[PDB]
Amino acid sequence: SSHHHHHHSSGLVPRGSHMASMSMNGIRWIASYPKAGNTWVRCMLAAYITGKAPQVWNDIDAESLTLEAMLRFGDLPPAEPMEPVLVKTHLKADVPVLGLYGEATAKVLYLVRNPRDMLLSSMRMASISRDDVEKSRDFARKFIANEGLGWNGVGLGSWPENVRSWTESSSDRFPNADVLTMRYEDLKGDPVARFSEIVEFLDLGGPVDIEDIRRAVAASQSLSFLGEDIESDYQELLHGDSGFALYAKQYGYAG
């Protein structure tokens, strides 16, 4: 009977090195809005580093693996890390806590997704069938009204807030950090190509093994049906120079 985290340790003793005889340290944030890619990348990453992907049945499971779940219990990733630390979060780049990793942060992976999809996939978080249209409308109505899911100057923020925080992060909040940005739809289109780019970009050490990545991969909408006014109101969001719209058009989710 072994501990459920044994795969996170080599368990080799005494420990040896490939770098010495006789990749850059820092935090790697895997960041996205809910249902916008960072759980999948966070699972794939485990598979690559560890050999074994975590067991994620639902959103509660997925939330276990975030900075936020870690915070609810008073823990924190290291701020003076001696190695690569990968931490998933959906939090906005400018919430106070992440103030502590200014110097610490090495890499930012930000993933965005079509908010149509985020919106629907989210409706499964709140435990809504496709048949309680009533509940759906209320959720979508509250989503469209908020331009996102942060309804209960911090937390997730609106979609455009979240996006602007991480994508603009390198300039001030994370000076030593490089930032890569990837649309979920692209990942889903070419997952092996794309995840190999992510692993290069995250600089965990050594040559990316494209076979190591293929195995690590294998492990892994209109709103009319809710009502005219839903689809309609969401479409106002995509019109503008104002923010939701700017981002929706830059990421190819408006037309």
Ligand X SMILES: COC(=O)[C@H](Cc1ccccc1)NC(=O)[C@@H](N)CC(=O)O
Residues 165 to 224 in contact with its own copies, rule: CB under 8 A: none
| Beta carbon nearer to its own copies, 149 or 204 | 149
| C-alpha–C-alpha distance, residues 26 and 164, integer Å | 22
Q: What's the farthest any 2 CA atoms get from each other in the chain?
A: 71
Residues 142 to 181 in contact with ligand X, rule: CB under 6 A: none
By CB under 6 A, tell whether 40 contacts ligand X.
yes
Which stretch, 40-48, 68-76, 112-120, 176-184, contacts its own copies (CB under 8 A)? 68-76
Which stretch, 32-40, 154-162, 167-175, 207-215, contacts ligand X (CB under 6 A)? 32-40
By CB under 6 A, tell whether 35 contacts ligand X.
yes
Which of ligand X, its own copies, none lies near 72, with the C-beta cut-off 5 to 8 A by kind? its own copies
Closest CA to 121 of 145, 102, 143: 143
- Return the residue of 127, 220, 232, 242 that touches ligand X, per CB under 6 A: 220
4 catalytic, yes or no?
Answer: no
- Return the residue of 11, 14, 96, 207 that touches its own copies, per CB under 8 A: 96
Residues 146 to 165 in contact with its own copies, rule: CB under 8 A: 154-155
Which stretch, 63-71, 137-145, 169-177, 178-186, contacts its own copies (CB under 8 A)? 63-71
**Active site residue: 4, 6, 18, 90, which one?**
90
Min CB(35)–ligand X separation in Å: 4
Residues forming contacts to its own copies in the complex (CB under 8 A) are 67-68, 71-76, 91-92, 95-98, 100, 154-155
Interface residues with ligand X (CB under 6 A) are: 35, 37-40, 121, 220
Instruction: Point out the residues that are catalytic.
Output: 90
